[PDB]
Amino acid sequence: DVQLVESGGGSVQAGGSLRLSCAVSGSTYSPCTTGWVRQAPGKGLEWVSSISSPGTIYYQDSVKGRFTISRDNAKNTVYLQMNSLQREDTGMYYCQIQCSIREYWGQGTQVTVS
Amino acid sequence: DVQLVESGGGSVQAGGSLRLSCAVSGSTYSPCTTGWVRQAPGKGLEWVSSISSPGTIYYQDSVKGRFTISRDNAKNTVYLQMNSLQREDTGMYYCQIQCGVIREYWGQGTQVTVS
Structure with a gap:
Protein backbone atom coordinates (compact mmCIF):
# COMPACT_ATOMS: atom_id res chain seq x y z
CA ASP A 1 0.00 0.00 0.00
CA VAL A 2 2.60 2.59 1.13
CA GLN A 3 4.50 4.33 -1.65
CA LEU A 4 7.28 6.95 -1.51
CA VAL A 5 7.87 9.07 -4.61
CA GLU A 6 11.00 11.23 -4.73
CA SER A 7 11.95 14.14 -6.97
CA GLY A 8 13.95 17.35 -7.27
CA GLY A 9 17.34 15.78 -7.98
CA GLY A 10 19.74 16.81 -10.73
CA SER A 11 23.16 18.15 -11.69
CA VAL A 12 24.42 21.42 -10.11
CA GLN A 13 27.37 23.84 -10.15
CA ALA A 14 29.34 23.16 -6.95
CA GLY A 15 27.79 25.54 -4.43
CA GLY A 16 24.32 25.69 -5.93
CA SER A 17 20.93 24.80 -4.47
CA LEU A 18 18.42 21.94 -4.63
CA ARG A 19 15.32 20.70 -2.84
CA LEU A 20 14.28 17.06 -2.75
CA SER A 21 10.78 15.97 -1.82
CA CYS A 22 9.54 12.57 -0.60
CA ALA A 23 5.81 12.19 -1.30
CA VAL A 24 4.03 9.57 0.78
CA SER A 25 0.81 7.87 -0.33
CA GLY A 26 -1.12 4.97 1.14
CA SER A 27 -2.16 3.98 4.66
CA THR A 28 0.55 4.57 7.27
CA TYR A 29 -1.99 4.13 10.06
CA SER A 30 0.27 6.36 12.14
CA PRO A 31 2.72 9.28 11.93
CA CYS A 32 6.26 8.19 11.08
CA THR A 33 9.92 9.06 11.15
CA THR A 34 11.15 10.20 7.78
CA GLY A 35 14.83 10.12 6.98
CA TRP A 36 17.20 10.61 4.10
CA VAL A 37 19.95 8.20 3.19
CA ARG A 38 22.47 8.80 0.42
CA GLN A 39 24.95 6.60 -1.40
CA ALA A 40 28.10 8.07 -2.93
CA PRO A 41 29.54 6.48 -6.11
CA GLY A 42 31.05 3.14 -5.19
CA LYS A 43 30.23 3.53 -1.49
CA GLY A 44 27.93 2.57 1.34
CA LEU A 45 24.76 4.18 2.66
CA GLU A 46 24.85 7.05 5.11
CA TRP A 47 22.23 8.66 7.36
CA VAL A 48 21.84 12.31 6.32
CA ASN A 83 22.39 24.51 -0.24
CA SER A 84 26.16 24.94 -0.40
CA LEU A 85 26.41 21.81 -2.52
CA GLN A 86 29.87 20.27 -2.37
CA ARG A 87 31.22 17.47 -4.57
CA GLU A 88 31.24 15.11 -1.59
CA ASP A 89 27.46 15.55 -1.71
CA THR A 90 27.31 13.65 -4.98
CA GLY A 91 25.26 10.47 -4.85
CA MET A 92 21.84 8.84 -5.00
CA TYR A 93 19.43 10.17 -2.31
CA TYR A 94 16.74 7.95 -0.81
CA CYS A 95 14.03 8.79 1.66
CA GLN A 96 12.99 6.16 4.18
CA ILE A 97 10.03 6.12 6.56
CA GLN A 98 9.69 4.17 9.80
CA CYS A 99 6.11 3.72 10.95
CA SER A 100 5.59 -3.31 14.39
CA ILE A 101 8.71 -1.84 12.77
CA ARG A 102 7.50 -1.39 9.18
CA GLU A 103 10.04 0.36 6.94
CA TYR A 104 9.73 1.75 3.37
CA TRP A 105 12.06 3.14 0.72
CA GLY A 106 11.96 5.39 -2.28
CA GLN A 107 13.49 4.70 -5.70
CA GLY A 108 16.11 7.32 -5.23
CA THR A 109 16.99 10.50 -7.02
CA GLN A 110 20.45 11.32 -8.35
CA VAL A 111 22.53 14.32 -7.30
CA THR A 112 25.83 15.25 -8.93
CA VAL A 113 27.78 18.34 -7.92
CA SER A 114 30.29 19.66 -10.47
CA ASP B 1 31.82 4.28 17.25
CA VAL B 2 29.48 1.48 16.20
CA GLN B 3 31.01 -1.08 13.88
CA LEU B 4 28.63 -3.36 12.01
CA VAL B 5 30.68 -6.06 10.36
CA GLU B 6 28.60 -8.23 8.05
CA SER B 7 29.58 -11.42 6.23
CA GLY B 8 28.47 -14.78 4.91
CA GLY B 9 27.98 -13.37 1.43
CA GLY B 10 28.72 -15.26 -1.76
CA SER B 11 27.43 -17.02 -4.86
CA VAL B 12 24.65 -19.59 -4.68
CA GLN B 13 22.74 -21.83 -7.04
CA ALA B 14 19.01 -21.32 -7.29
CA GLY B 15 17.21 -23.40 -4.67
CA GLY B 16 20.30 -23.23 -2.49
CA SER B 17 20.51 -21.59 0.92
CA LEU B 18 22.69 -18.97 2.60
CA ARG B 19 23.05 -17.48 6.06
CA LEU B 20 24.27 -13.95 6.71
CA SER B 21 25.81 -12.44 9.84
CA CYS B 22 25.80 -8.84 11.06
CA ALA B 23 28.28 -8.33 13.91
CA VAL B 24 27.42 -5.39 16.15
CA SER B 25 30.37 -3.69 17.85
CA GLY B 26 30.52 -0.55 19.99
CA SER B 27 26.81 -0.22 20.80
CA THR B 28 26.51 1.76 24.04
CA TYR B 29 22.79 2.37 23.60
CA SER B 30 19.99 0.05 24.75
CA PRO B 31 18.43 -2.50 22.46
CA CYS B 32 18.24 -1.12 18.94
CA THR B 33 16.37 -2.47 15.95
CA THR B 34 18.60 -4.52 13.69
CA GLY B 35 17.46 -5.46 10.23
CA TRP B 36 18.55 -6.00 6.66
CA VAL B 37 18.00 -4.03 3.46
CA ARG B 38 18.96 -5.26 0.04
CA GLN B 39 19.76 -3.37 -3.12
CA ALA B 40 18.77 -5.41 -6.14
CA PRO B 41 18.71 -4.56 -9.87
CA GLY B 42 15.12 -4.41 -11.06
CA LYS B 43 13.91 -3.49 -7.59
CA GLY B 44 16.15 -0.85 -6.01
CA LEU B 45 16.54 -0.60 -2.21
CA GLU B 46 14.14 -2.64 -0.12
CA TRP B 47 13.73 -3.60 3.54
CA VAL B 48 14.04 -7.37 4.07
CA ASN B 83 16.11 -20.40 1.86
CA SER B 84 15.18 -21.21 -1.74
CA LEU B 85 17.31 -18.35 -3.00
CA GLN B 86 15.56 -17.30 -6.18
CA ARG B 87 17.37 -15.30 -8.91
CA GLU B 88 15.35 -12.25 -7.81
CA ASP B 89 17.11 -12.44 -4.42
CA THR B 90 20.39 -11.40 -6.01
CA GLY B 91 21.92 -8.16 -4.81
CA MET B 92 23.90 -6.29 -2.19
CA TYR B 93 22.74 -6.89 1.42
CA TYR B 94 23.36 -4.45 4.24
CA CYS B 95 22.36 -4.72 7.84
CA GLN B 96 21.52 -1.55 9.70
CA ILE B 97 20.88 -0.73 13.32
CA GLN B 98 18.61 1.93 14.69
CA CYS B 99 19.21 3.02 18.25
CA GLY B 100 16.87 5.77 19.44
CA VAL B 101 13.70 7.17 21.02
CA ILE B 102 16.54 8.16 15.49
CA ARG B 103 20.11 7.29 14.53
CA GLU B 104 20.88 4.45 12.14
CA TYR B 105 24.08 2.89 10.87
CA TRP B 106 24.90 0.56 7.99
CA GLY B 107 27.54 -2.01 7.28
CA GLN B 108 29.73 -2.11 4.19
CA GLY B 109 27.48 -4.67 2.55
CA THR B 110 27.82 -8.24 1.35
CA GLN B 111 27.18 -9.44 -2.21
CA VAL B 112 24.80 -12.34 -2.85
CA THR B 113 24.61 -13.64 -6.43
CA VAL B 114 21.85 -16.19 -7.02
CA SER B 115 22.78 -18.02 -10.23
Missing part, protein backbone atom coordinates in the same frame (compact mmCIF):
# COMPACT_ATOMS: atom_id res chain seq x y z
CA SER A 49 19.06 13.89 8.36
CA SER A 50 15.86 12.81 10.07
CA ILE A 51 12.67 14.18 11.47
CA SER A 52 10.86 12.06 14.05
CA SER A 53 7.12 11.64 14.28
CA PRO A 54 6.96 14.15 17.17
CA GLY A 55 8.79 16.71 15.04
CA THR A 56 12.36 16.27 16.27
CA ILE A 57 15.06 17.02 13.67
CA TYR A 58 18.56 15.50 13.44
CA TYR A 59 21.49 16.09 11.09
CA GLN A 60 24.64 14.25 10.12
CA ASP A 61 27.26 16.58 11.65
CA SER A 62 28.62 16.72 8.10
CA VAL A 63 25.63 18.53 6.57
CA LYS A 64 24.55 20.90 9.37
CA GLY A 65 23.85 24.45 8.24
CA ARG A 66 23.79 23.37 4.59
CA PHE A 67 20.88 20.89 4.61
CA THR A 68 17.43 21.69 5.97
CA ILE A 69 14.67 19.10 6.46
CA SER A 70 10.99 20.02 6.65
CA ARG A 71 7.74 18.07 6.62
CA ASP A 72 4.33 19.11 5.37
CA ASN A 73 1.98 16.68 7.11
CA ALA A 74 -1.00 17.92 5.15
CA LYS A 75 0.71 16.83 1.91
CA ASN A 76 2.46 13.92 3.67
CA THR A 77 5.65 15.14 2.02
CA VAL A 78 9.16 15.47 3.41
CA TYR A 79 11.66 17.90 1.98
CA LEU A 80 15.42 18.25 2.06
CA GLN A 81 16.75 21.72 1.25
CA MET A 82 20.28 21.36 -0.04
CA SER B 49 13.54 -8.05 7.76
CA SER B 50 14.01 -6.51 11.22
CA ILE B 51 14.17 -7.56 14.87
CA SER B 52 13.21 -4.72 17.25
CA SER B 53 14.73 -5.59 20.64
CA PRO B 54 11.60 -6.48 22.63
CA GLY B 55 11.85 -9.51 20.37
CA THR B 56 9.34 -8.43 17.73
CA ILE B 57 10.26 -9.73 14.28
CA TYR B 58 9.07 -8.21 11.00
CA TYR B 59 9.34 -9.55 7.45
CA GLN B 60 8.93 -8.17 3.94
CA ASP B 61 5.91 -10.05 2.52
CA SER B 62 7.96 -11.34 -0.42
CA VAL B 63 10.34 -13.17 1.92
CA LYS B 64 7.96 -14.43 4.60
CA GLY B 65 8.37 -18.17 4.79
CA ARG B 66 11.74 -18.25 3.03
CA PHE B 67 13.65 -15.99 5.41
CA THR B 68 14.34 -16.15 9.14
CA ILE B 69 16.06 -13.54 11.24
CA SER B 70 17.52 -14.43 14.65
CA ARG B 71 19.74 -12.92 17.31
CA ASP B 72 22.36 -13.87 19.87
CA ASN B 73 22.56 -11.14 22.50
CA ALA B 74 25.66 -12.91 23.79
CA LYS B 75 27.70 -12.52 20.60
CA ASN B 76 25.80 -9.30 19.84
CA THR B 77 25.13 -10.87 16.42
CA VAL B 78 22.13 -10.94 14.07
CA TYR B 79 21.55 -13.69 11.51
CA LEU B 80 19.41 -13.95 8.40
CA GLN B 81 18.65 -17.44 7.07
CA MET B 82 17.76 -17.32 3.35
